[PDB]
Amino acid sequence: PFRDARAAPDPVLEAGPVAHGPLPVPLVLDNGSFQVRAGWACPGQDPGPEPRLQFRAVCARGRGGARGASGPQMLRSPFDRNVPVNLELQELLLDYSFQHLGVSSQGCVDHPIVLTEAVCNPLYSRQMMSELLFECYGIPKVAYGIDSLFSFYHNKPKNSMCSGLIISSGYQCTHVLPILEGRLDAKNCKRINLGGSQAAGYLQRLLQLKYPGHLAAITLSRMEEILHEHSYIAEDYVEELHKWRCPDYYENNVHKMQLPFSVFNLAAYHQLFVGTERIRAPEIIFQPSLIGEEQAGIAETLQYILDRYPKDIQEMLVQNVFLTGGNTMYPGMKARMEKELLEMRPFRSSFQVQLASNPVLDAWYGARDWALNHLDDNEVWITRKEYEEKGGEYLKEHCASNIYVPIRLPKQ
DNA sequence: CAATATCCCGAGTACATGCACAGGATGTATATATCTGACACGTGCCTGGAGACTAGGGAGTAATCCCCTTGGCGGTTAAAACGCGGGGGACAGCGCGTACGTGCGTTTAAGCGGTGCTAGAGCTGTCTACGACCAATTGAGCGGCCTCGGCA
Numbered sequence: 001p002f003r004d005a006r007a008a009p010d011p012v013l014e015a016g017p018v019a020h021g022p023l024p025v026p027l028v029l030d031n032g033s034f035q036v037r038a039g040w041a042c043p044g045q046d047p048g049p050e051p052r053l054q055f056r057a058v059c060a061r062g063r064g065g066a067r068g069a070s071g072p073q074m075l076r077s078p079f080d081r082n083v084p085v086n087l088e089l090q091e092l093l094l095d096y097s098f099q100h101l102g103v104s105s106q107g108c109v110d111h112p113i114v115l116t117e118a119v120c121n122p123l124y125s126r127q128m129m130s131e132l133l134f135e136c137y138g139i140p141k142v143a144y145g146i147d148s149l150f151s152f153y154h155n156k157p158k159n160s161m162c163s164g165l166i167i168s169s170g171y172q173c174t175h176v177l178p179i180l181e182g183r184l185d186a187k188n189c190k191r192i193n194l195g196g197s198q199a200a201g202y203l204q205r206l207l208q209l210k211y212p213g214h215l216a217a218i219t220l221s222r223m224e225e226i227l228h229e230h231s232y233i234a235e236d237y238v239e240e241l242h243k244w245r246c247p248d249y250y251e252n253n254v255h256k257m258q259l260p261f262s263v264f265n266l267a268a269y270h271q272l273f274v275g276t277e278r279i280r281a282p283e284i285i286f287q288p289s290l291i292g293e294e295q296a297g298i299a300e301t302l303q304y305i306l307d308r309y310p311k312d313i314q315e316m317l318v319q320n321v322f323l324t325g326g327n328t329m330y331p332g333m334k335a336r337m338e339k340e341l342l343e344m345r346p347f348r349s350s351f352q353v354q355l356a357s358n359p360v361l362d363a364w365y366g367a368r369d370w371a372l373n374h375l376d377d378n379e380v381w382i383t384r385k386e387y388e389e390k391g392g393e394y395l396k397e398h399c400a401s402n403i404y405v406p407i408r409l410p411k412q
Numbered sequence: 413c414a415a416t417a418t419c420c421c422g423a424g425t426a427c428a429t430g431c432a433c434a435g436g437a438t439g440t441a442t443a444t445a446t447c448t449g450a451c452a453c454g455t456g457c458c459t460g461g462a463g464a465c466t467a468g469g470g471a472g473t474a475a476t477c478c479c480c481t482t483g484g485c486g487g488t489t490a491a492a493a494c495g496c497g498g499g500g501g502a503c504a505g506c507g508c509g510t511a512c513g514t515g516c517g518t519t520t521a522a523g524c525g526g527t528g529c530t531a532g533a534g535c536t537g538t539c540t541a542c543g544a545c546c547a548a549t550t551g552a553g554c555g556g557c558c559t560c561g562g563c564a
């Protein structure tokens with residue numbers, strides 16, 4: 001039976017939890033598309049004690065017009081396909097986050113910040129995100145990095161130079177990232193235009209067509225439960241669906257999702273039987289052709305990037321296949337990935353598949369551990385004055401960050 | 413002549429209508445405007461006129477029986493009228509849509525310069541289609557040979 005989600009927690013703090021040693025403790029801000037995750041670096045403690053503000057990245061303002069609201073509670077959100085592209089709907093998302101974390105007082109946030117961004121970020125987008133940050137909030141110095149690569153940095157066996165493929169899958173994108181000597185080989189990195197949002201959207205539209213008698217009973221927040229709790233990824237889809245074909249297996253494995261009641265009441269207050277549907281929603285990232293979409297999918301793409309290298313460095317970078325982010329949470333994901341990988345390697349060769357320690361939070365914990373180390377490496381950060389000579393389309397090439405290129409944007 | 417029916421006249425009957433009222437949105441009122449197109453001017457075409465001639469058609473007639481037209485036909489139901497059934501008719505309320513208002517932002521119109529699409533050109537330059545004629549076919553009717561039924 002379905003549950004309902006929680007809302008409106010009580011995060012309130014003093015003006016700044018400044019510890020011993022250096023006073024400018026940075027904010028660690030994972031600016032996610034599904035949800036934002038934000039908090040103080042809190043140095044000198046091994047386990048990250050409190051990743052506060054776990055909240056959905058969505059805002060309310062309706063037919064009333066005169067007000068808007070920002071916490072977990074018609075709706076809007078600041079992103080287009082995992083790049084932020086909104087003005088004040090970004091501000092009132094930052095404002096919520098700062099106010100609930102506490103801030104000093106004066107006409108700026110006194111603390112430096114580390115902020116996640118898109119695997120590639122359009123130059124205009126980076127420029128705007130820098131302007132909307134330095135101008136309005138007055139931050140002293142800033143760092144941009146990629147969610148996935150922070151999660152890798154967290155999960156590495158050692159704080160040392162590495163190579164691998166990162167497999168990442170968030171709200172509206174999945175990416176395959178080849179990395180060599182700690183550097184993202186962004187020349188031949190690739191992404192797929194699908195993700196967990198689109199899975200839920202498909203599972204919704206399926207069950208709407210299965211039970212037209214009660215369109216209103218099924219809605220995204222209930223699709224979330226069946227997709228998180230009750231769905232799994234096949235080892236081989238055309239074989240799973242084949243064992244699902246016989247009634248004696250079906251009845252033993254179909255999921256009985258009881259709606260809340262007011263004929264045994266199921267003619268409207270149905271038990272929403274999900275069978276094959278609990279496979280067809282996860283599978284979208286491996287076979288986007290279950291939707292209309294003609295793209296290679298996470299299987300053909302991995303082969304298509306992996307055959308663009310010399311045969312020795314393939315055998316190097318496949319030694320660390322890493323799973324992180326959103327959709328990798330499905331049960332069975334490691335097994336499907338390592339089976340699909342076994343067919344596309346030399347007959348006796350070796351590979352290894354690692355799953356992130358906490359697939360959803362390790363991006364933030366990574367950004368924490370990174371900033372807490374690189375406090376004083378002033379070649380890594382963008383300082384407030386640099387933004388006055390370099391127009392905002394500028395970045396500092398540390399590991400776990402997008403590849404910079406010399407370029408400039410006309411503005412007046 | 414009797415009977416069912418339509419017509420006609422006066423009592424008694426809700427509300428419909430015509431009115432008065434407040435007030436609001438728009439019709440007026442003035443000044444300005446360019447430009448539609450009025451008007452004026454020739455250009456050049458066809459609408460018309462005007463002849464000579466054949467041949468196609470039209471008009472006429474003649475004969476006539478097909479078709480219409482009529483009477484009288486025989487056969488069966490729409491109408492008449494009644495009994496008889498249920499169904500169209502008159503109140504209580506829910507809330508869903510429609511409207512309407514707000515702020516939603518998509519697109520068009522305009523004016524910009526460049527340029528290639530189309531629509532008037534040809535004797536284009538032929539040659540599909542247009543007569544012109546020939547040939548095949550079927551069908552129908554008229555002679556001609558031959559078994560049999562009713563009559564000497």
Ligand SMILES: Nc1ncnc2c1ncn2[C@@H]1O[C@H](COP(=O)(O)OP(=O)(O)O)[C@@H](O)[C@H]1O
Pocket residue numbers: 031032033034035082147169170171172195196197200227228229325326327329330360
């Ligand atoms: N436990 C889970 N099982 C399955 N899917 C999950 C789970 N938790 C989150 N998701 C999916 O993860 C996606 C969001 O992941 P996230 O890393 O926050 O995205 P991003 O970094 O792009 O904002 C959502 O589409 C959601 O459906």
